[model samples]
Target chain A: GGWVSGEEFYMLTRRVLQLETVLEGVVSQIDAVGSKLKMLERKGW
Target chain B: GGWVSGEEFYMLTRRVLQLETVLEGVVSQIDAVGSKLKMLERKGW
Candidate 1:
């Protein structure tokens, strides 16, 4: 059995999940700013 | 090939694709805002 290989794979999977969470937060902020800008442009003020 | 395998494969692939889409959106927004900032800075505004 390749125990070391399995352990490394699991660790990589966990790290990917953590990165995804962080990226999600960043994307949410970007969307919020984009929305605010669109609203400002629409109001022309 | 193990019969009990391939269970996590599709799930992981789907999750990765979803993350890729979100990251793409974030990058696009970042680029748009960055370009606007550059233009404003060039005009000394």
Candidate 2:
């Protein structure tokens, strides 16, 4: 039989989801970082 | 905002912080994604 500890924790689920979101957006964010760097370079910051 | 909701829904804050981590470890994680792809290619589902 399966057991539940009354259960309201989503630590594992949330951690997985957050990391997925992190990796999923990693490339795009890198691109944005690139563009931001360019912007700063243009501003000579 | 105890922890999961705290971690999960800083939604914007987490998004922003992750970008920083992604950039800071840009080389490592970029390599990481490539490796994950490699696993898919060989055992490739």
Candidate 3:
């Protein structure tokens, strides 16, 4: 968690983390919207 | 499931599921700590 890019990594990681958060929110809403999709085939999607 | 990284990717794919788990924990926690974050203009936290 420390290096020259520590702050850069920190910011990049902050970006990736936001991805998870956004993706997490996206996923859950997808789950909520795609209720049957919760257990269905994703490739089918 | 082979060729290495996919295993990790599989694991990371598996790990993505874990992100949901953690994001959930974070979202839940954020639901507590990030409540103010929820009320934004462009959902851009």
Output the number of the DockQ-best candidate: 1
Give the C-alpha miss distance for residue A33 in model 3, angstroms.
Answer: 1.3
| Model 2 lDDT per residue over A1-45, tens place | 543221233444456567768676867787786688789999987
| Model 2 chain A: lowest-lDDT 10 consecutive positions | A2-11
Pick the winner on lDDT between candidates 1 and 2. 1
DockQ of each: 0.30, 0.05, 0.05
Ranking of all candidate structures by their lDDT, best first: 1, 2, 3
- Cα lDDT tens digits, model 1, B21-42, are 8788778878888998999999
Candidate 2 residues B1-45, lDDT tens each? 232345444564565576567656777766876787799889956
Q: What does candidate 3's lDDT look like per residue over B1-45, in tens digits?
A: 112333433544554577767667655744653555566634775
Docking class of 3: incorrect
TM-score for each model: 0.71, 0.27, 0.36
Clashing residue pairs, backbone N/CA/C < 3 A, model 3: B6-B10, B12-B15
Best by lDDT: 1
Q: Report how far off residue B30 is in candidate 3 (Å).
A: 27
Model 1: docking quality category: acceptable
Candidate 3's residue-wise lDDT over A1-45, tens digit each? 422334443454466667776776875764564466445665574
Candidate 2 colliding pairs: B40-B44
